[PDB]
A paper describes a structure:
In this study, we determined the three-dimensional structure of L. pneumophila effector protein VipD, whose function in macrophage was unknown. VipD contains an N-terminal lipase domain which shares sequence homology with patatin, a phospholipase in potato tuber having phospholipase A and lysophospholipase A activities. In summary, the structural and biochemical analyses identified VipD as a signal blocker disabling the key endosomal regulators Rab5 and Rab22.
Full-length VipD was crystallizable, but the X-ray diffraction of the crystals was too poor for structure determination. Various attempts were made to improve the crystal quality, and the successful trial was to employ a truncated VipD lacking C-terminal 46 residues and to dehydrate resulting crystals with 30% glycerol at −20°C. The structure of this truncated version of VipD, referred to as VipD(1-575), was determined at 2.9 Å resolution. VipD(1-575) folds into two domains which are roughly discernable: the N- and C-terminal domains, designated as VipD(1-316) and VipD(316-575), respectively. Ala316 is at the boundary of the two domains and located in the middle of the structure lengthwise. Likewise, β10 of VipD(316-575) is a part of the central β-sheet in the N-terminal domain. Likewise, a similar groove covered by loop β10-α14 is present in VipD. These features indicate that VipD is a catalytically active phospholipase A2. VipD(316-575) contains ten α-helices and two short β-strands.
Residue numbers in the entry:
A (entry chain A), B (entry chain A): -1 to 558
Write the structure that this text describes.
């Protein structure tokens, strides 16, 4: 990860990041997996946050959560995000999301038929308190360095909260206590009166700013520090996006920038949708609203796209399943290969036809790429919600669960021959790869050839752009020679790799190669003679899924 | 330490703090020392910060610095404060303060005959960078948890700074490199151009706030975390007070509230005196100026007055030495005892006179008290400075050194008998005391009697306020009985303790006792008879220094 400040230098000196993970299977193969996921971004969308439950379950089962360091979100995303961040556990997170009387979450204390937002913010505080209190007690006896000052502040805040709730006759020791509280409206009113009594800010003698009475973003840091090493991961670094109505742009609140901001206050603001709530208002007097109504979620600063999962839920069924989108493309790819093959009589000998363009397939992934975008169809669950249809809910949930699983699966790819893996990744992204031990040997032997090949690919492009095609064939034959002799690849493997290389050159040249090939074949047809170009083209149209598969059969027999 | 948020509860439940430190000497005595000093507050005053050098030397020799967790300051104080905070070492801190061409620190880039402030802020950045870079390299090889993200950000900032300075042909590896830089004006101009090129803020795609390119208050946290335990104390938690000209009140910037604030920018602002600099301006567009021109320094939030040293320098010689102020009072105290004794013929038998009041000595410390206020006379060194008189400088320095030493000495007191110590401290502040091991036995035996005595003191007051003096004598005799029999104190010790008790009762009763005594003596004189009141009064006027001394002779022979 690189901070935007590093871009201010005249001569940047790229640091080493990790975007890939090459490993060697017990099977003896090589697998290209994405790097461990560090950040999670939950896009806004209103009450479609019931789905996030499914998405979390997926990450849970797959053990992806534990290695998260950052969590950012807006609207429903923001809440979910904060519950994750505050180190709550799935069991309870699940119990919360599905169990909160969001219907009674919308106070009437508002005006003009809109909630004031104070109640929602109050339930959040009760939650953060309850969960942070449990962690606070997970700390050991010592408590030495400035960890004595932090421990005190937290202990005191939790103290303040309880004194206020006790007097109110409210007692919360766990998730259920909270959920039950939301069901009683008389109790909810006691909550508001109780917690609303706590001031927004506290200034001192000379009007200096004092510690926020409420649990803040910064307290998450205070808590993380105090905890034992093996438990520090439980608490995440939370970012909350919001729309600053006054400045009319989004504003992000986080533990590293606005550590003195109330967790509950920010999350409530992030969900202060203009349709359901009256705008919020910060200390500066600027008006705040739902973080998802003006623009999309900004990325987490210190991380790389490759390390961050972005979940974005939307109403209706605008999006299509991932697996059914893969097989739809795969089928089209195979269809195109067939189209090229079945057209050989007209293409080479004679007939009335005209070839299409790889441009009707330029939506082909020629290099390894990680897609970290999780799209979820929420169905009939839109921003405005009053319908907890036992169905529409269970559908949106598992619908979100499946999506996380699908995208999570599209990450790992497995190749048979290390040269293949490396050629797909590209010598470029090879340096930003986290290579394994058992792999290092063959990988670097293979990268040597990969470089020799790359140089040739590059040269072909270079020479064509200068309008010199005299050596295109020769260079191509050379690349094949390297794959056969130097790399020693089976006939099938070689065929697949060479196919890939041909494709990558076409890409790098922006179809300048394919045009040449087609022209050569065409002239050859006119001369009533064969052409070396035909073989290369048949390889160009090979189906990419095959090129990457471990089929062990030629493109022709690839079914799927 | 208690946060002001804990004051919001209906029923506060006082936490245990530490304001005292009872220990047992090898001599076999008991000493009442102040608690370890946690915070240091350096009041504003303009360029009188040359004196702070002396004050630091004192703390250094006395090992008081190492246990500091917080450092707060304004104006000259702010700079000094930040250099301390950034873990710099005395040797260099000394070399810096005295060696900076503050004369050439005041750029001409300003307007209306005032510095713009950009240069001063630039030298500060060069300093923070240089010192933080050294610490950054003190970190070990591992760097594991989110300590990888921090380490990166710092490494990058330092990187940015150097790239800018290198291009400028500037190289700083130590304090001297910096000092020398300040001597060349052509070099200083290169610095400004170089560092001024770095933007104030950096916003992203959607206008989200991004990491400050400059070293921030928050980076101090980043650095502290990264360092090895035994070295975490090197880096202090910095607060910087400033005057917000626009809002016309002071504003405090700190690592826990405004972690994203530039250290250099804040310190420069804190010293942006209206006479020498044009006002500063923050992101909100509010105007900023010297933190010491509008009001005094506010206290560090989580700490107790008892744990914080406050240094406040002022021009001229308004203040008087501490030792010469003690002996001046001591002499007056002894003089008063003499006045009471030499007046006994008139007081008891007959003569024309009229007694003064303990109110001419109510400036007498009846209970143990810690004075943490260090006052320094800066002499002819005022806010506006152009006079680095080799003298006036050395005078202000050592003048500040002596003061820290004096006040630092007035802290420890040593008593012979544990009951004495406890009676001076007061059963009240006894609970907030950090008692030692070897002491616990006798202390709690002694506190039992102390309580019995307190109850009696209290009772005397209680009964007098209800206009009942019938048992004043009896109660007093009882207290003496407890000191003689129960505590078993030498005649001298007993006399001293009883004196103290009599005084404390007078205080608690607001001279209601002394009035009674005097009246009793007066009536007794009229009846031509002696009075028990005379003894008590002679004890009331005993000199407090004696009462607390280990003289081992009666008040009469106390010289000093």
């Amino acid at each position: 990860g690189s901070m935007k400040l590093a871009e201010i230098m005249t001569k940047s000196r790229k640091l080493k990041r990790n975007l890939l993970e090459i490993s060697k299977t017990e099977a003896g193969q090589y697998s290209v997996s994405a790097p461990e996921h560090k950040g999670l971004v939950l896009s806004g969308g209103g009450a479609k946050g019931i789905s996030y439950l499914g998405m979390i379950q997926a990450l849970q089962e797959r053990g992806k959560i534990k290695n998260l360091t950052h969590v950012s979100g807006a609207s429903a995303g923001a809440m979910t995000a904060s519950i994750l961040a505050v180190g709550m556990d799935i069991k309870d997170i699940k119990k919360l999301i599905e169990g909160l009387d969001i219907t009674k979450l919308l106070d009437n204390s508002g005006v003009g038929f809109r909630a004031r937002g104070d109640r929602f913010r109050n339930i959040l505080d009760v939650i953060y308190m309850m969960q942070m209190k449990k962690h606070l007690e997970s700390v050991q006896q010592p408590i030495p360095p400035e960890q004595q000052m932090n421990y005190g502040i937290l202990k005191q805040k939790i103290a303040l909260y309880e004194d206020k709730l006790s007097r109110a006759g409210i007692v919360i020791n766990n998730v259920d206590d909270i959920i039950n509280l939301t069901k009683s409206v008389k109790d909810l009113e006691k909550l508001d009166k109780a917690l609303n009594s706590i001031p927004t800010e506290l200034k001192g003698a000379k009007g200096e700013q004092l510690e926020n009475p409420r649990l803040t973003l910064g307290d998450l840091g205070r808590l993380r520090e105090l905890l034992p090493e093996e438990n520090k991961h439980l608490i995440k670094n939370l970012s909350v996006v919001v729309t600053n109505q006054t400045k009319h742009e989004l504003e992000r609140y986080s533990e590293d920038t606005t550590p003195q901001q109330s967790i509950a206050q920010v999350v409530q603001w992030s969900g202060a949708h203009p349709v359901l709530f009256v705008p919020g208002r910060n200390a500066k007097g600027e008006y705040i609203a739902d973080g998802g109504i003006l623009d999309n979620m900004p990325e987490i600063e210190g991380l790389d796209r490759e390390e961050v999962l972005c979940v974005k839920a939307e109403a209706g069924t605008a999006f299509e399943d991932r697996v059914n989108k893969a097989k739809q493309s795969a089928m089209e790819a195979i269809s195109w290969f067939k189209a090229r093959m079945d057209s050989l009589v007209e293409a080479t000998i004679g007939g009335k036809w005209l070839h299409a363009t790889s441009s009707v397939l330029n939506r082909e992934k020629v290099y390894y790429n990680i897609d970290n975008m999780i799209y979820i169809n929420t169905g009939e669950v839109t921003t405005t919600n009053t319908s907890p249809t036992p169905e529409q809910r269970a559908r949106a949930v598992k619908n979100g669960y499946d999506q996380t699983m699908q995208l999570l699966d599209s990450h790992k790819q497995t190749f048979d021959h290390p040269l293949m893996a490396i050629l797909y990744i590209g010598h470029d992204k090879l340096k930003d790869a986290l290579i394994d031990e058992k792999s290092e040997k063959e990988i670097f032997e293979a990268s040597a050839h990969a470089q020799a090949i790359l140089h040739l690919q590059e040269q072909i492009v270079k020479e064509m752009n200068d309008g010199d095609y005299s050596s295109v064939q020769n260079y191509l034959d050379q690349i094949e020679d390297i794959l056969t002799v130097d790399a020693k690849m089976d006939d099938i493997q070689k065929e697949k790799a060479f196919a890939l290389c041909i494709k990558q050159v076409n890409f790098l040249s922006e179809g300048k190669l394919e045009t040449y090939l087609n022209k050569v074949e065409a002239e050859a047809k006119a001369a009533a003679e064969p052409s070396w170009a035909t073989k290369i083209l048949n390889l160009l149209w090979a189906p990419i899924e095959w090129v990457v598969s471990l089929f062990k059969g030629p493109a022709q027999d690839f079914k799927v």
